[PDB]
Amino acid sequence: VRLQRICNHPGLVEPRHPGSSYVAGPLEYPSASLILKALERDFWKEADL
């Protein structure tokens, strides 16, 4: 039976599968919320340039 299946088509015994990429979860970079508040500078110290 197996030999007959192979004779009919080899895709019956082992299909060709789609080739796929490995999906890696995004890297989570943790940091303090105060870091993003850097370079903000104080209102009432910033003039109109």
Q: What does the binding site for other proteins look like in residue numbers (CB under 8 A)? A: 17-18, 20-24, 26-27, 29-36, 38-39, 41, 44, 47-49
Smaller CB separation from other proteins, 2 or 29: 29
Smaller CB separation from other proteins, 3 or 39: 39
Residue 3's region, left for phi above 0, alpha for psi from -120 to 50, else beta, is: alpha
C-alpha–C-alpha distance, residues 4 and 8, integer Å: 6
Smallest distance, other proteins to C-beta of residue 3, A: 23
DSSP conformation class of 12: G
